[PDB]
Ligand binder design. Structure first.
Ligand SMILES: [K+]
Lengths: 308, 120, 265
């Protein structure tokens, strides 16, 4: 039953992930500095879909070659429960975090089956002065963009953005370690490994979560409560799932446009953490599950053994 | 019949449980922890806790003199935890020097327990 | 206002409502007739002390006996200084102010104190900071400083406030509802019996209860705040929090939300 990876104990559990609506947008600016500013203000306040509006993250920085604009850009993902709630959140965030940022321009990030109106709705801030243009892109496909007049110039925004089907969120694996300062470093180099997978992001601050989201609760209609089992202050008593050597636990949550990306992002995090884990006191690695019946996708750590 | 702190070998057949080093008061607190589910299993008092909760009419007999004020409040708390599952009670032992009647009488004459002064 | 103790007390004496606010209102000759004796024969303030009165919020009792019950009780203003030893219930139900005692103190000192600071430069008696008979709580918010060593049941059924002791006896922090007790030195056997919530910090400690489990050596933000709080008040126990501490969880007989900190090694 016990599993050992790179000399560090790994529990024989699975990560319970859920099906989610996901979409991607490419935001470009004249400089990469302001491309990042625009994305950073858009991704903020988006660590969970249940409390925050959505789950947002920056997938990758784009060079002037990887972009339809020809200007340095940013590929930024957004996830939500329902395709309507996702549309509602994208409209709010693009409208007041992208449109407001100077010199920006919004394009559709990923290809998908369902359509989401973006430029066609922000066009109404133009007060009837906005115009629409249709142009074939570098691949040969006819795309429609809106031109909203603003103080700095024109905010060009593609009419529609596509939402990919089968985007998976909630894939997580948590680390148990002796000391906060050192074990944070283990998780830090763990998120750096996971970020690299295309189409996958980590919404929480720096990718790391310190509050253990537990389903249910002790009193009345608790929807979420802290995970008393993995709390170091509640050690020694029955119901604490961590050994006496452990003193700090940190969780890593991954969302991705494709299910395979969730598994590959977890695998890379699982390996990178254990390789350096012994040096910084990493005791063990487990995954968060809810019982098996809540979430469709199960990411067993036993399948993540193969090196990347 | 279970016994905490009683003699190990008696004429009457009973299941005796060894008292802790600190004393009966320390054992009483130790026992309540297993009944609350706060301490790991496979201990001596863990079996005792399992046997108590599996009850129909439970009585814990004790002498408040030898157990002490703190132990009795703990003992009375252990009963409150036990009553979440089955009916449990305490058989508080009486003193042999009419002290319990003095409490009864003083309560309805003065409005308070004994050890009362009328200087004012 | 100075009360010069004439001599030794023949019976127990109750100094309740003998607060400089109350003495200032009453006339100097009228205040002498105030009876404070427990017995039927009783004793008036003039029989016990040499009353020198002035319209001030400062009171100083020159000379003290262990038969001075309820000294500083229900004090809501100003200060009372006892140059000597005192009896039970130092500042029972003290609302606010400052109450300093040169000598030692009697049992149940500090009960029900809401605000202010009670300082005992000597040693505290049994049940110091603890609840009296049938009392809902012991210390209920006023901070109690004992430069000497407290007896058994320090902070018994304490609800609020802070206790700063030099040394402590057995069953310290028993039945504690909430609060913080920092004894710089020794701590008696079986500390925190029945503890529900609260923070107990000691340099030395006796035998611990089986219902106390060790959490480890965690660097907590609260510890940093409690240290700075002790530094600002000039506490000798401030140095005890400088190093890394060992933690124990509150007694599992009640809800285990209390804690105990002892230096690592
Ligand atoms: K990335």
């Amino acid at each position: 039953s016990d599993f050992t990876l790179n000399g560090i104990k790994v529990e024989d559990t699975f990560a319970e992930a859920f099906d989610v609506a996901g979409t991607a947008i490419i935001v470009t600016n004249d400089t990469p500095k302001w491309a990042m500013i625009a994305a950073t203000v858009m991704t903020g306040f988006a660590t969970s879909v249940i409390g925050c509006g959505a789950e947002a993250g920056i997938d990758a920085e784009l060079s002037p070659d990887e972009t339809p604009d020809g200007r340095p850009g940013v590929r930024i993902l957004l996830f939500g429960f329902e395709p309507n709630g996702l549309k509602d959140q994208l409209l709010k965030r693009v409208g007041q975090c992208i449109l407001t940022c100077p010199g920006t321009a919004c394009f559709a990030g990923v290809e998908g089956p369902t359509k989401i109106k973006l430029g066609g709705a922000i066009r109404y801030f133009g007060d009837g002065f906005a115009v629409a243009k249709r142009l074939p892109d570098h691949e040969g496909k006819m795309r429609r963009y809106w031109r909203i007049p603003v103080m700095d110039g024109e905010f060009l925004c593609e009419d529609s953005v596509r939402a990919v089907d089968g985007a998976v969120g909630g894939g997580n694996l948590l680390f148990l370690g002796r000391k906060h300062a050192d074990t944070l470093i283990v998780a830090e180099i763990a998120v750096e490994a996971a970020k690299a997978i295309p189409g996958a992001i980590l919404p929480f601050p720096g990718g790391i979560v310190r509050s253990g989201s537990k389903v249910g609760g002790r009193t009345k209609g608790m929807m979420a409560s802290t995970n008393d089992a993995y709390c170091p202050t509640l050690k020694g008593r029955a119901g604490s799932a961590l050994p006496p050597e452990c003193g700090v636990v940190l969780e890593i949550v991954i969302d991705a446009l494709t299910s395979a990306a969730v598994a590959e992002s977890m695998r890379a995090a699982l390996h990178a953490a254990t390789e350096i884990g012994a040096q910084h006191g990493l005791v063990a690695v487990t995954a968060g599950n809810y019982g098996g019946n809540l979430g469709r996708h199960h990411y067993h750590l036993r399948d993540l053994l193969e090196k990347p | 019949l279970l016994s905490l702190g009683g003699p190990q070998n008696g004429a009457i057949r009973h299941v005796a449980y060894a008292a802790d080093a600190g004393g009966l008061t320390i054992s009483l607190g130790h026992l309540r922890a297993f009944a609350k589910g706060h301490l790991a299993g496979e201990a001596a008092f863990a079996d005792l806790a399992k046997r108590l909760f599996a009850a129909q009419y439970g009585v814990i007999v004790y002498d408040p003199e030898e157990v002490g004020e703190l132990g009795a409040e703990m003992l009375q708390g252990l009963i409150r935890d036990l009553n979440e599952s089955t009916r449990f009670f305490a058989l508080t032992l009486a003193d042999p020097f009419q002290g319990r009647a003095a409490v009864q009488l003083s309560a309805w004459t003065t409005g308070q327990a004994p050890r009362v002064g009328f200087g004012r | 206002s100075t009360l010069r103790l004439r001599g030794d007390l023949p019976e127990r004496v109750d100094l309740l409502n003998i607060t400089p606010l109350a003495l200032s209102g009453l006339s100097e000759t009228e205040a002498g007739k105030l009876a404070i004796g427990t017995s039927r024969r009783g004793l008036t303030l003039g029989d016990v002390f040499e009353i020198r009165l002035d319209g001030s919020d400062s009171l100083v009792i020159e000379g003290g006996s262990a038969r001075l019950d309820r000294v500083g009780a229900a004090l809501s203003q100003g200060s009372i200084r006892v140059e000597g030893d005192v009896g039970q219930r130092l500042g029972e139900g003290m609302a606010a102010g400052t109450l300093t005692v040169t000598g030692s103190a009697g049992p149940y000192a500090g009960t029900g104190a809401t605000g202010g600071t009670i300082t005992i430069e000597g040693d505290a008696g049994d049940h110091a900071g603890g609840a009296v008979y049938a009392a809902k709580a012991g210390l209920d918010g006023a901070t109690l400083v004992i430069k000497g060593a407290a007896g058994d049941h320090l902070g018994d059924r304490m609800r609020r406030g802070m206790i700063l002791a030099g040394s402590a006896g057995a069953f310290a922090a028993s039945r504690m509802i909430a609060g913080t007790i920092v004894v710089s030195g020794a701590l008696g056997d079986h500390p925190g019996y029945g503890m529900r919530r609260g923070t107990l910090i000691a340099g030395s400690h006796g035998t611990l209860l089986p219902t106390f489990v060790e959490t480890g050596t965690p660097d907590l933000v609260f510890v940093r705040l409690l240290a700075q709080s002790l530094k600002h008040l000039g506490a000798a126990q401030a140095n005890l929090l400088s190093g890394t501490l060992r933690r124990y969880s509150g007694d599992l007989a009640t809800l285990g939300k209390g804690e105990l900190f002892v230096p690592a090694h």
